From a paper:
pmcThe specific interaction of proteins with the nucleosome is central to the regulation of chromatin function and dynamics. The tardigrade damage suppressor (Dsup) and vertebrate high-mobility group N ([name]) proteins bind specifically to nucleosomes via a conserved motif whose structure has not been experimentally determined. Here we used cryo-EM to show that both proteins bind to the nucleosome acidic patch via analogous arginine anchors with one molecule bound to each face of the nucleosome. In addition, to study nucleosome structure in the context of active chromatin, we analyzed nucleosomes that were reconstituted with a promoter-containing DNA sequence from a [name] somatic 5S [name] gene.
We first obtained three structures from a non-cross-linked sample of the 167 bp 5S [name] nucleosome, which contains a 10 bp linker DNA on each end. The three 167 bp 5S [name] nucleosome structures, which we refer to as closed, open I, and open II, lack density for the linker DNAs and differ in the interactions involving the core nucleosomal DNA. The closed 167 bp 5S [name] nucleosome shows density for the entire 147 bp core DNA, which is wrapped around the histone octamer, and the open I and open II conformations show additional flexibility in one or both DNA ends, respectively. Modeling of the 5S [name] in the 147 and 167 bp nucleosome structures revealed that DNA unwrapping is more prominent on the end that is downstream from the TSS. First, the downstream end lacks density in both the open I and open II 5S [name] nucleosome conformations, whereas the upstream end exhibits high flexibility only in the open II state. Second, the lack of DNA density is greater at the downstream end (beyond superhelical location [SHL] +4.5 in open I and open II) relative to the upstream end (beyond SHL −6 in open II). In contrast, in the two open states of the 5S [name] nucleosomes, R77 of H2A near the downstream DNA end adopts a conformation that is not compatible with a fully wrapped DNA turn. Furthermore, R86 of H2B facing the downstream outer gyre of the nucleosome establishes fewer contacts with the DNA than R86 in H2B on the opposite side. Thus, we observed asymmetries in H2A R77 and H2B R86 on the opposite faces of the 5S [name] nucleosome that mirror the different flexibility of the DNA ends.
Residue numbers in the entry:
A (entry chain B), B (entry chain F): 21 to 102
C (entry chain H): 33 to 124
D (entry chain D): 31 to 125
E (entry chain G): 13 to 118
F (entry chain C): 12 to 118
G (entry chain E), H (entry chain A): 37 to 135
Amino acid sequence: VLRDNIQGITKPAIRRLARRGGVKRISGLIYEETRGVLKVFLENVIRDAVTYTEHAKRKTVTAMDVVYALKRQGRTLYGFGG
Amino acid sequence: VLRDNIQGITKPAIRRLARRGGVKRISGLIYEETRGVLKVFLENVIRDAVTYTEHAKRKTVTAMDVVYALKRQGRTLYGFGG
Amino acid sequence: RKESYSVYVYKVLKQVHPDTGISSKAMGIMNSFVNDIFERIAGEASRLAHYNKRSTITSREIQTAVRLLLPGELAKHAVSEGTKAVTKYTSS
Amino acid sequence: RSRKESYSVYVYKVLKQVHPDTGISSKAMGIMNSFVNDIFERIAGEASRLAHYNKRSTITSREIQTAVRLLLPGELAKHAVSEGTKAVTKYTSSK
Amino acid sequence: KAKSRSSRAGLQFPVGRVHRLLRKGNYAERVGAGAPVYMAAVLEYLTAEILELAGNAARDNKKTRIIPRHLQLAIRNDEELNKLLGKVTIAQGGVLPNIQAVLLPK
Amino acid sequence: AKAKSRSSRAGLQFPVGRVHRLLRKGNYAERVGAGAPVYMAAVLEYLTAEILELAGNAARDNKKTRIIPRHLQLAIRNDEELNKLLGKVTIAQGGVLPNIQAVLLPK
Amino acid sequence: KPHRYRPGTVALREIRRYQKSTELLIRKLPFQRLVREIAQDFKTDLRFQSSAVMALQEASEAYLVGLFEDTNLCAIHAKRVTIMPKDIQLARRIRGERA
Amino acid sequence: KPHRYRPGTVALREIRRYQKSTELLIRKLPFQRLVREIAQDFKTDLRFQSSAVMALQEASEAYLVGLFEDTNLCAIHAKRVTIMPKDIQLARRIRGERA
DNA sequence: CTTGTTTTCCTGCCTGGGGGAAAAGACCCTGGCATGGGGAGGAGCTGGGCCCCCCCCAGAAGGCAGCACAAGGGGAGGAAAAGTCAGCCTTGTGCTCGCCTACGGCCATACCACCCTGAAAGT
DNA sequence: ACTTTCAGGGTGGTATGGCCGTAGGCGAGCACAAGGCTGACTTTTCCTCCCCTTGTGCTGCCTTCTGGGGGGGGCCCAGCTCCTCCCCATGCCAGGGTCTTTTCCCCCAGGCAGGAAAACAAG
């Protein structure tokens, strides 16, 4: 998992997400744009979750850590506890 | 203070607000849309302010009531106490 | 051990939909909903007491927290529900 | 008339430290007081939520530091954490 | 003659556990006697309101069980519930089927 | 013993004792540690000094010797970190940043 | 014929002037009347602090100016320089006020 | 010659198919590797609960779908059906993620 | 590419008003003392997160055809911008009234705290 | 179905908050200019909108191959629990050092007149 895993978000996957979003046609640079946007979002959430994990003096990120990190960013998530 | 005071937000005032927003050209339908948007925003803030005032068993709405109403909507205001 | 509202969400489901069941995934979601609304109402009532320099959360602070947090017709029915409960609870 | 309280005195001392020859107006001082109260409330609420998440009863400098890390952006949080740690070290290890 | 307080208030939500949650939640120094009753009435009302619409959605799909999809359908179809839970993600809930009218063939 | 100020002991200007009292009476936890007020009063002093320095720079740029709300707003909206911290905050009588999109400028 | 400025340069001068200032761009009396008229529907025989009305006005000006900035960005997106109601609507829908 | 579909009908049927489902649209293993690669710059030797990675994936997918709806609105604003990186940029800026 | 024309910046002069210092006090912070309790630490246990193995088929990737959509150009019209002129209504000032709010004082009941037990809800 | 943890009953104490009284600050209300801002009309220009056309970039489809998903097994570390106890935080009281409110006056900001300079747009 060390290097260049952003390409694992394949163009078919991004098209599936866009289709769920109601998008009909997709330009070719959208895939790179989406990879960057998702990377920024994930960096924010995982930084907040790791902060909680480190404060709890744990070595394992729990689903509750992610739920708290999402709550403090304004995106509440139901279905993983809380 | 009883009827039709939304028209007191005049077209020159809306133009000045747009100019502070950096707008160069304004359509003639923008004024009656800005008035409705402002009306909705003021209704939302004043409802919460009056709810705070009634909870405090007061009859005069205070700057602190308004500040709490604005804070509750993610619109924290500096300068009028708090 | 751990606690939740599963016993009471189920007893509420059997009152509005006596035949319909609930998945453990849907029940776990309903538990996050109840905990999220409780912390919303209690947090607003906590601030309401602090603004007024009170040290007690009474039914008045819960009633005002409900009217601040819930939308129009949800608040009218939630307040009518809470008021009806306290009226019957205090009167025997 | 009941006496109110504010951060104006300490804001003024910090201002005379950072800019010895420039003043401040009453409205700017009110904004400074609102800012200090806002940040205090933010950090204290975050530390309270942290201590509740970890089933703790005491809000500690550890909770304050983790609230600061969760609330401030990169360089601001770095420098605020450093300032808080140095202040607590001076308080505990001297005088 | 040791009646429960939930039975005294006529509710199916736990007044005693709501009272304990309010007392140990660091919300104020004191908690009044009617506050847990009011809070447990509001929570019960909201839970019933959501479950009714979720069961309606489940019956709409000829399913006898409420699932996260049905909860999502109920929340997003109800205008007041959508406004209340406007910043909430329901896991495995999906989205409402919605296509912009410009994307449909002429 | 001659009462020694905890702010002086910590090295700060902000009121460590008043911060402790506000933490204790704010209903945040059952207990408040001894280092929590000292840490919070240091963070609040650092964040005050940052804004005050930037606003003093903004006042000097305008050839004023007294900070007014305009200077605080200019400091906040020109600092990347402070703008992010106070992104949902309205400064009364602070104005907006000078900014015109290139599309609207004359050709 | 007299001297006349081209359409759009006085607008730029006004943009510069109003972005250099901090004063309130809506007259205080009509805004106060609007605030009282709106509060009537929530509670009759209400009173207001001058500071309360001032806080409401400052909040409203900040809100409207930010909304106009987003509206201008939507107008430029649609390859226009004139802002239209649909630009305000798109801005509000994206920021989450229209859904 | 064989029969083929016109460009757009398959797009609409894919929209209809993926708007009726709830399953995650990203492959779980490459999403997990991405999450573990991002977390490596915050703390080395991090373990992850399977439910934690699942929660991250559900949050990320809901965020991307909600963003693509706003991107589609911005694309339609410019009299288009194809979404471009500038539509995403405008949507994120108006949302507040780019300011 | 010049010259006239509005508009804004700069500088000196006058002025006023609001902020920074001074003083009395009042109020809460600190020191000192006693004390229960929470959380840090040393074990012990086991649940699950990691890691490897094998298989397979479902999905991704690359290529090709073809088409439909984005974009640029051109032209018409209609709708803002700018300028001018008459009016009106905001605002700054001044005077009045009385209502509401905030404080004080007294006390009453409502909630905390604690000791026990039975039952509710968690596994 | 067992159980074991917690909600309910009864009692003591006091502290928070409710009620009556009171005073003044400030919010509402009324005149009264007057002049600066608004409303309206006119010109016309320039920006929006529509139509056409090109080519390029996107989609749809087909085939190959990879790698994600799904079991299967081992393991060892990390999270959780339990028991000690001790150091820290809490509660309380006495006394002064700090911070709040009032007073004032002098310098920094506001207003204005006059001149210089800087873009603008016509030719």
